[PDB]
Amino acid sequence: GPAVGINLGTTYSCVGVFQHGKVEIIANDQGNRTTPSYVAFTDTERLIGDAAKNQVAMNPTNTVFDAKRLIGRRFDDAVVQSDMKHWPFMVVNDAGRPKVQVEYKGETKSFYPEEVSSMVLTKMKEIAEAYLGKTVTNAVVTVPAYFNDSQRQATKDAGTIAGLNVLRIINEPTAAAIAYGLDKKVGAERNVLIFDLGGGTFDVSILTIEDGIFEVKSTAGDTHLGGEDFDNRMVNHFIAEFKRKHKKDISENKRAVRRLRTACERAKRTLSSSTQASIEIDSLYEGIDFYTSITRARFEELNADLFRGTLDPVEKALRDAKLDKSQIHDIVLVGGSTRIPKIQKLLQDFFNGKELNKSINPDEAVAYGAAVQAAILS
Numbered sequence: 013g014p015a016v017g018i019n020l021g022t023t024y025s026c027v028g029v030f031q032h033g034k035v036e037i038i039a040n041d042q043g044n045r046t047t048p049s050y051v052a053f054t055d056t057e058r059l060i061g062d063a064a065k066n067q068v069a070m071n072p073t074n075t076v077f078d079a080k081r082l083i084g085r086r087f088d089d090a091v092v093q094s095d096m097k098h099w100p101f102m103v104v105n106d107a108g109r110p111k112v113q114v115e116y117k118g119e120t121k122s123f124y125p126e127e128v129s130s131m132v133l134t135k136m137k138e139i140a141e142a143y144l145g146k147t148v149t150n151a152v153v154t155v156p157a158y159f160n161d162s163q164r165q166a167t168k169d170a171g172t173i174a175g176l177n178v179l180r181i182i183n184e185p186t187a188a189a190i191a192y193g194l195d196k197k198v199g200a201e202r203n204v205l206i207f208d209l210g211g212g213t214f215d216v217s218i219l220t221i222e223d224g225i226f227e228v229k230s231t232a233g234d235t236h237l238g239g240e241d242f243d244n245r246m247v248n249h250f251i252a253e254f255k256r257k258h259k260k261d262i263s264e265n266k267r268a269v270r271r272l273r274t275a276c277e278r279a280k281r282t283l284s285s286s287t288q289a290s291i292e293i294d295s296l297y298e299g300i301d302f303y304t305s306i307t308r309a310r311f312e313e314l315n316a317d318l319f320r321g322t323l324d325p326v327e328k329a330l331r332d333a334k335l336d337k338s339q340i341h342d343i344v345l346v347g348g349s350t351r352i353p354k355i356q357k358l359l360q361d362f363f364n365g366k367e368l369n370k371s372i373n374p375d376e377a378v379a380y381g382a383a384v385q386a387a388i389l390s
């Protein structure tokens with residue numbers, strides 16, 4: 013069977029396969045081309061992907077996500093300590109290693125970050141196999157450029173326990189470059205800027221490519237800025253609106269909020285193609301139906317400061333890399349959040365009208381590149 017390319021992301025994962033000179037991005041059972049990096053445990057089963065995310069508000073303490081933030085890290089890590097203050101699930105310390113603790117079938121169980129990730133990885137593999145109509149063994153999995161040997165190790169391990177023969181672990185910015193073919197030899201040095209804004213992380217990487225050899229000159233970004241922060245702004249906005257029209261605050265009801273958030277994330281995606289979207293939520297609080305809508309104009313101003321700040325890390329990346337705007341040859345958009353019009357405008361304006369690389373769905377770019385690489389390595 014063919015080797016596949018997999019993008020193991022913080023919020024979503026994607027799997028592609030190179031076959032007949034073309035790369036195919038494989039959709040799941042629900043028909044989505046990317047699946048949530050969620051795993052949920054219940055009295056009767058273990059849900060992975062969409063099925064998992066589709067019940068988080070009902071099973072918050074037993075629904076695991078953000079495993080990418082834990083992977084290859086230690087419990088004593090200041091990162092872990094800060095992060096765990098926001099997860100609805102338990103993170104325990106097993107001899108220095110962090111472990112997620114859930115209740116599965118009435119019994120208490122705990123897993124290592126790599127095991128959780130292998131569950132998502134297994135879902136991608138069967139998604140691929142269902143499409144390919146054959147077993148998938150070899151694979152190329154992606155990882156950020158800043159991941160150290162421990163993190164890369166853990167990612168490789170997650171692959172092995174998932175029954176995948178990880179041919180290689182390549183960086184996400186490099187995979188993106190390969191997706192557009194910016195790795196071909198043109199007898200000259202080329203500077204590429206990868207602007208990656210996903211569900212929860214923002215990475216800016218400046219690559220230098222000469223003779224087919226990549227060289228990450230610089231990196232910058234924010235580990236806690238992504239599409240979810242945009243959703244939060246909408247949520248707080250609608251919470252205030254509901255409070256106005258119905259004299260009722262819904263902040264305390266955790267389910268009402270999570271349901272509202274799910275509606276917002278969806279309206280947000282629509283807003284990337286339309287100028288306004290309706291929020292139709294039956295019986296949000298008490299028996300009160302919440303029917304309303306937002307416009308792109310409002311959505312933009314709700315996140316104005318966030319969108320604008322996206323340029324600071326870009327300036328710094330350039331600065332550290334010892335380059336000027338005019339020196340970067342190609343700019344490729346990565347991450348689902350880059351589909352937002354205002355982000356594209358903002359970046360283009362910063363690079364004085366330069367054309368942005370974005371013909372390939374940004375949230376499928378990394379997988380796409382990995383699939384090509386997997387093909388060459390087989």
Ligand SMILES: Nc1ncnc2c1ncn2[C@@H]1O[C@H](COP(=O)(O)OP(=O)(O)OP(=O)(O)O)[C@@H](O)[C@H]1O
Nearest residue numbers: 021022023024210211212213239284347348349375
């Ligand atoms: N049309 C769209 N407009 C805006 N945001 C979108 C759109 N389509 C998808 N997204 C967003 O993209 C995000 C998911 O991005 P992606 O699939 O690239 O994530 P990822 O690699 O898991 O990201 P990270 O590693 O930062 O979490 C979500 O915040 C989702 O709302």
